[PDB]
């Protein structure tokens, strides 16, 4: 690995993400954006499902 090496021979950092889902509940999920809360008004609420 040298500065003058060809692009094919230049170093490349490789990061592979693999996602495995077995017969078990899933822990790693995406973020769940939440809206602001309003009091003293008739609203349709959803708290933790």
């Amino acid at each position: 690995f040298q500065p003058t090496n060809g692009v094919g021979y230049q170093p490349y950092r490789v990061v592979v993400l693999s996602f495995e889902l077995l017969h078990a509940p899933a822990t790693v999920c995406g973020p769940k954006k939440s809206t602001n809360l309003v009091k003293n008004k008739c609203v349709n609420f959803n708290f933790n499902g």
Binding site: H23, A24, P25
Partner: peptide, 22 residues
């Protein structure tokens, strides 16, 4: 092949362990 990992007389320590749908 791991599928999980978590890290955090005088005493009566009672415990109840159970499994429901995994």
């Amino acid at each position: 092949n791991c599928t999980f990992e978590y890290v955090s007389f005088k005493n009566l320590r009672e415990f109840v362990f159970k499994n429901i749908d995994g």
